[PDB]
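Exercise 7. Given the components listed, write out the predicted structure of the assembled complex. Treat all entries as one system.
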Amino acid sequence: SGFRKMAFPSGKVEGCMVQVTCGTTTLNGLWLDDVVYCPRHVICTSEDMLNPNYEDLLIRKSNHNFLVQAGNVQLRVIGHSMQNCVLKLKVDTANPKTPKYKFVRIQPGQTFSVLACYNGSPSGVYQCAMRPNFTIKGSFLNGSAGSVGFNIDYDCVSFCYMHHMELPTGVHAGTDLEGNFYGPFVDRQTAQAAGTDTTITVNVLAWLYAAVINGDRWFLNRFTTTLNDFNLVAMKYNYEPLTQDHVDILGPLSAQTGIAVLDMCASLKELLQNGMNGRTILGSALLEDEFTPFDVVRQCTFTRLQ
Amino acid sequence: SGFRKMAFPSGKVEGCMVQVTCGTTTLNGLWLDDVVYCPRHVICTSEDMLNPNYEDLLIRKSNHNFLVQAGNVQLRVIGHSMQNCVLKLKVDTANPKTPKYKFVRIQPGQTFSVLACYNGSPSGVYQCAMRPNFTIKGSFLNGSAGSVGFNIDYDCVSFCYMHHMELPTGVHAGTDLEGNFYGPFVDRQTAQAAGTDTTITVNVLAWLYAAVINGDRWFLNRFTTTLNDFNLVAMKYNYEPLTQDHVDILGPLSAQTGIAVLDMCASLKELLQNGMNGRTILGSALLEDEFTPFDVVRQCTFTRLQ
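Answer.
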């Protein structure tokens, strides 16, 4: 037993990570087959004019301006194109380690594994959830842009995030693998702020279900409530509304634990009104909302079926 | 910026994982060159009286009895022997994916990355700290035994832990790669309890530094204290006593923060008594003690040396 934030194994992703340098600017690229994808602001430099326009600056760059290295080997750029906020760098060598993959746009509330990288070299791995305000609470320094996030589904690496920038609040923003930002953000030197965030109600219920599976059940009561009355409570604590779709996604954890979803909502309603009473749940003094129902099941299993 | 529990990329380790099956028991193995390392209780059968004779089961078993799988490929065991609580299965093929590696005995307070496995097949990765009572707080199900914990140092993998079992309190126990258990535990079906766990004082300090580097400062104070003076307020509070060895270790964090360790100790003493008064530090409502100083440094940029 035991429950912990757990990243997907990063081996498949590590073999696609490369360093991209244009001028004195370096960041990370993702090498699949004969293409390297990377944030377009690799072409930005110090001596650029204020609030540059990427159209104009890329026009100055030739193939020979982009220096891509996969370890101690130079990949030769043979073509470049810009697709929204990412650069597609056609190279003359196919990555022999390209996994089965898909490009995916995750929804808010969902999690993914982040392979933070520097200078083309993977550095560490951890879980993030896409916040309802379309930011993630990551750990990224300068040189980490191009790091990707991803999930594994059977044999297929689903890439869902490429990191670009940090916001003044200290939270992070990036694109899908087509260069489309999550949230109202731009890879520009313009003032931006994350909007107000909300708590991912469905995730907190999954976490409480995980808590029960692991024997942490002090917060259960005989009580139950309705979907309407729970949501009237949730709204007042900045929790996002709970939909029947959410209730159904919690099915397997309710089947597994024997605790009906609306039973769980009553315990949660109670922790929201009266607090955690100095108690910790799974070693946390706060309510965790970055564990999806899938992430719990992934870690406990369904033992009804023998 | 930002601060997160971060596992090492697990790629170099995933290529070492294999599946070991003796009779009806299946757990994971570690395939380094031409040796597979695994827990000895893979040979245990519940049909045993219980108190096992591991040595004579080695005589009882032949090489045929051990089924080693790298994916769907079988490795013929050509030798088998016991070293403390670990099996060393000699196979006919040397692991072509063997990395540069050491075998190390971690010290209580140090951290490592656990690659959680079932059936030779990686499931996920997360950080653990070896607790002062020689347990770890992981997420391990039945069949997770044989999973390893490791640290990457350049391109050399330091294997420091192999998981064997779970204690009735929900924490986990294991050996180094030489089969020697961390702590007074044995791999038998007998009543065992972990001693009293204590907070790793040096690590809470390192964490408080990570917050200051990252922006969380409210806890700081112009107040000061001394070493024995701080260790008074702490020993009664179940904390590891702080030593001059720990002070020095935090040197670089103080150097970057310009905050003296004793000054940090003072505001930490203040944090023990008062409590956090509904306030968080780096997204946490309790003091985190599983970030070592070096773990912090790896997630910070250091203005000093330019």
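Discussion: Chain B touches chain A at residues 1-11, 14-15, 115-116, 122-126, 137-141, 166, 170-172, 214-215, 280, 283-286, 298-301 (CB under 8 Å). Residues 220 and 267 of chain B are 6 Å apart (CA to CA).
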